[PDB]
């Protein structure tokens, strides 16, 4: 007996389900929208319904709402909506964590129940390159002694409080560092994604994952990884070949192993990605 | 804004409610049975809607695993119930974590559509008096180190992953030790309620609090806590002598007085410390924190927000 079910794309794909669960064009052009190209038939045959899934979660926890409203005889300490329902996206760099939750981001968004769905990715709570340089910590960015753990805790604090105006520090790709004073506000929406590498991992104290209400973690082949981390920093020569190794070696693999991946046991949801990249194993946590 | 919302107990009574599946007399004075400490006024007053809440959550779960099974169209790897849901309770040694669980377990068992509901301490993995002893813990029993962390964790674990059967072993606070070959099972049961020390402690990778669907932390003043601590030994000295079996323990032999410098002693170096150390800080991870006064009564609730 194990905690987890788990499917196969050929299990999964021969699951006949309720829902027609067909691609609609505001969900393209939603998708288009966050800057995203990803294949179709991974969004109709595995997206769709996870999303389908993740709706019935958050769809539950609004009727609890209401119902625990309902019982306490709606009270004024009690708020007058949900508090966003929060989901976590986990994995290595380059493992298409941004992808999996930008997807997800547009597609919950379609139901007239939670239309309002926010994405923040938690690289905005890095240390800015001069604070890490003061630290010695630019060769450890995105470990965790890399992010400014007490900041990222508030924001998710402040947004599980039901607070109409939180706001999260940009992270810069362009720069590859802290915009100085740059926002990201966010405005009670319905729906929260937090993606980063850190998101499932265990302080001791208490953590940015006790106020996730479901959470993913992106997996695959070690091996599969690093190619892909090669392929992004070429897109960014047999020199850029081995400078991508290098920060991979350094960097990112060692914080995979001793960081990341003993995190992924503590996922809702883990979906394992074949070299192809697309989805060849969903692991869910039993109900 | 907090994550919490509020309430003293004025405004928890001053708030309407329904009174949901309400007891009989009978039913009530049956609650009497779970110790000679049992008011029954909280217990209609707080634990009961307590329990109502707590059994809205419960059924929302059900439906869902129903929704997700019927979506997903009744797979053969899809179990056919719902796994049990899993209910933390926390806080310091003698604040009334088990009392509170033993109340709460029997109203949640009075719902049809969960009946069964179990209660399981995590005393009973603190490794055996000889085994700390081995391992040079004795003086920090109730620490995190002095509990098998692997053995609990595959308890609970077994238990979520739906299991039919898993067993834990059973601690005698008469005789401050394990017993040797005794066994607690437990049967996929609709709710487990998990009471202890360590559950709501934050560990490496996994905690045992990663299979928690609720939690509670029932807190106080330390000043009342060590009060009700010294009491409950003085009751415990006199409990063991009386005891066919446990009379034969120096402690059985204290005097009043002798008793409370030993109590204030174990307070002072073991229990209060821990509590510092490793109890209080995970109150702010309780769904619920329950604040009791001197006199036992919660004051404060705060619960966090849907």
Same mark, same amino acid.
Request: aromatic letters at 8%.
């Given at each position: 007996?194990?905690?987890?079910?788990?499917?196969?794309?050929?299990?999964?794909?021969?699951?006949?389900?309720?829902?027609?669960?067909?691609?609609?064009?505001?969900?393209?052009?939603?998708?288009?929208?966050?800057?995203?190209?990803?294949?179709?038939?991974?969004?109709?045959?595995?997206?769709?319904?996870?999303?389908?899934?993740?709706?019935?979660?958050?769809?539950?926890?609004?009727?609890?709402?209401?119902?625990?409203?309902?019982?306490?005889?709606?009270?004024?300490?009690?708020?007058?909506?949900?508090?966003?329902?929060?989901?976590?996206?986990?994995?290595?760099?380059?493992?298409?964590?941004?992808?999996?939750?930008?997807?997800?981001?547009?597609?919950?968004?379609?139901?007239?129940?939670?239309?309002?769905?926010?994405?923040?990715?938690?690289?905005?709570?890095?240390?800015?390159?001069?604070?890490?340089? =003061?630290?010695? $910590?630019?060769? #450890? %960015?995105?470990?965790?002694? *890399?992010? !400014? &753990?007490?900041? /990222?805790?508030?924001?998710?604090?402040?947004?599980?409080?039901?607070?109409?105006?939180?706001?999260?520090?940009?992270?810069?790709?362009?720069?590859?560092?802290?915009?100085?004073?740059?926002?990201?506000?966010?405005?009670?929406?319905?729906?929260?994604?937090?993606?980063?590498?850190?998101?499932?991992?265990?302080?001791?104290?208490?953590?940015?994952?006790?106020?996730?209400?479901?959470?993913?973690?992106?997996?695959?082949?070690?091996?599969?990884?690093?190619?892909?981390?090669?392929?992004?920093?070429?897109?960014?020569?047999?020199?850029?070949?081995?400078?991508?190794?290098?920060?991979?070696?350094?960097?990112?693999?060692?914080?995979?192993?001793?960081?990341?991946?003993?995190?992924?046991? =503590?996922?809702? $949801?883990?979906? #394992? %990605?074949?070299?192809?990249? *697309?989805? !060849? &194993?969903?692991? /869910?946590?039993?109900?």
């Amino acid at each position: 007996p194990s905690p987890y079910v788990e499917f196969d794309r050929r299990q999964w794909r021969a699951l006949r389900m309720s829902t027609p669960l067909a691609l609609t064009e505001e969900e393209l052009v939603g998708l288009r929208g966050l800057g995203e190209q990803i294949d179709l038939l991974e969004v109709e045959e595995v997206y769709l319904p996870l999303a389908r899934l993740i709706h019935l979660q958050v769809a539950a926890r609004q009727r609890l709402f209401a119902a625990t409203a309902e019982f306490l005889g709606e009270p004024q300490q009690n708020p007058d909506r949900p508090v966003p329902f929060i989901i976590g996206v986990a994995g290595s760099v380059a493992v298409g964590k941004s992808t999996t939750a930008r997807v997800l981001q547009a597609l919950l968004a379609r139901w007239d129940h939670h239309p309002r769905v926010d994405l923040v990715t938690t690289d905005g709570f890095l240390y800015p390159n001069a604070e890490l340089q =003061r630290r010695n $910590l630019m060769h #450890r %960015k995105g470990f965790p002694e *890399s992010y !400014n &753990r007490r900041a /990222l805790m508030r924001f998710v604090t402040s947004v599980k409080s039901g607070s109409d105006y939180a706001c999260a520090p940009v992270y810069s790709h362009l720069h590859y560092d802290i915009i100085p004073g740059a926002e990201q506000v966010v405005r009670h929406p319905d729906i929260l994604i937090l993606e980063g590498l850190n998101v499932l991992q265990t302080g001791p104290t208490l953590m940015v994952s006790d106020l996730f209400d479901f959470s993913l973690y992106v997996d695959a082949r070690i091996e599969d990884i690093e190619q892909w981390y090669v392929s992004r920093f070429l897109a960014m020569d047999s020199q850029a070949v081995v400078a991508a190794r290098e920060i991979w070696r350094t960097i990112n693999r060692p914080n995979l192993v001793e960081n990341i991946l003993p995190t992924r046991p =503590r996922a809702t $949801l883990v979906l #394992r %990605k074949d070299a192809d990249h *697309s989805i !060849n &194993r969903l692991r /869910l946590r039993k109900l």
